From a paper:
pmcMenin, a 67 kDa protein encoded by the MEN1 (Multiple Endocrine Neoplasia 1) gene, is a chromatin adaptor protein that interacts with MLL1 (Mixed Lineage Leukemia 1, also known as KMT2A) to regulate the expression of multiple genes, including HOXA cluster genes. Menin has been identified as an essential oncogenic co-factor of MLL1 fusion proteins found in acute leukemia patients. MBM1 binds to the central cavity of menin, utilizing Phe9, Pro10, and Pro13 as energetic hotspots, which occupy well-defined hydrophobic pockets, and positively charged arginine residues (Arg8 and Arg12) that are involved in electrostatic interactions with the negatively charged binding site on menin. Importantly, recent clinical studies found emerging resistance to Revumenib treatment and patient relapse as a result of somatic mutations in MEN1, leading to point mutations of T349M, M327I/V, and G331R/D. Understanding how these mutations affect menin structure as well as the interaction with MLL1 and current menin inhibitors will be crucial in the development of a new generation of inhibitors maintaining their activity against menin mutants.
Residue numbers in the entry: 2 to 53, 74 to 386, 399 to 459, 537 to 538, 549 to 588
Amino acid sequence: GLKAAQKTLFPLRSIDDVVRLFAAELGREEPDLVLLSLVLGFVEHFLAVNRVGLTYFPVADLSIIAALYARFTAQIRGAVDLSLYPREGGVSSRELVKKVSDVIWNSLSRSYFKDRAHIQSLFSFITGTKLDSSGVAFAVVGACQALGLRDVHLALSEDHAWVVFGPNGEQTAEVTWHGKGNEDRRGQTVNAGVAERSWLYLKGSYMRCDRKMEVAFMVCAINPSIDLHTDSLELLQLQQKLLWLLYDLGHLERYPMALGNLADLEELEPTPGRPDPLTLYHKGIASAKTYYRDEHIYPYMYLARYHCRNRNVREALQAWADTATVIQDYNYCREDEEIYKEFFEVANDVIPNLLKEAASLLEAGSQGSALQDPECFAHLLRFYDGICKWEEGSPTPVLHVGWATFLVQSLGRFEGQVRQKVRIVSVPPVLTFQSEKMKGMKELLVATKINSSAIKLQLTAQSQVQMK
């Protein structure tokens, strides 16, 4: 049951009332994930999914929220019999975690589109019997909290979610699906994925949430988008206020992606007296370096995108070179295709467009241009070096000739006299290459006219030219 003290702020009549509820829950022993997710899902439904009749804020009456809460706790209590799964030592068993995951799974609609917006919350689970992948993982954690299983917590990589549990919180279990058309591993550890050094499991440097970070996850999971062209200003404001609440309490310290989300929101609508977006992007990077062995990709991607939106070519290139410096120490594995797609888009779409405009601006007499800065050429080379190194040792290749066309184009945007200024130094501006592909490219990088067939051959598996 909801406790009397959790009920005193209702009805929630505004954004600020929702913030007060979050503040009150975060001041408790254990914030109530089920309560909080139902409230966010309710207000998201009436602010983004169906705004018919909206005049200011969708008032959340206790009767409505308590009935939804009852629908959730009744299903879980009815379907999970704890007596069948004795808690040896005040911690949960793998079989109990599997049973909770099965209860959530089996409740879902038989067929639906899993990539849809607004299917992340317990409100969606109860009212639509629909959840997205990470929403299932969150729902398992919320169900386990409702059952009294204090040791079950959300684990997060940059592209997946699962749970940790058991003695010392040591154990991992898959509870949801990943992607589309991958091998289901529900009930299993994540140790094989850690051991193969895939991006999906971050070499083990994934997030282990406490209950406060699970609150942060649901706040990051708010989706303000009404349609392809329109975001809810109300939900943007709510998400931003809740993220500042979490920030002030210390609960974003170990949550790089939340810091990037908050930076993006500040760029859209700055809050007076708060840190600038750039400061926040750098805090996200610092969080990843401090708590996650600098093994995360997205802190640098967030930064690079900010610089790319502000047409700061130099700083954008630097940040994408830093993204590649992280990926180089991974193996490219079968379920890592999201980060492959991201690197492909940066190399083969975003950087080309940025350099195309820089070339037009140089023609018009720009000063201090990235295209005249050898340190920016060095960043471009370091980006490709990290992608080539990533590929080394990987079970699946990364580069192909479709990348080569864009590499040659991008190289050519820098004049030979600029390119010549970078010194590529061996172990045992200056740049050291880690990848064997780039080390073999070195001479080709300073010619007045780039040799395109030679570059293609060096970047790719191809080793012959056409016969005729």
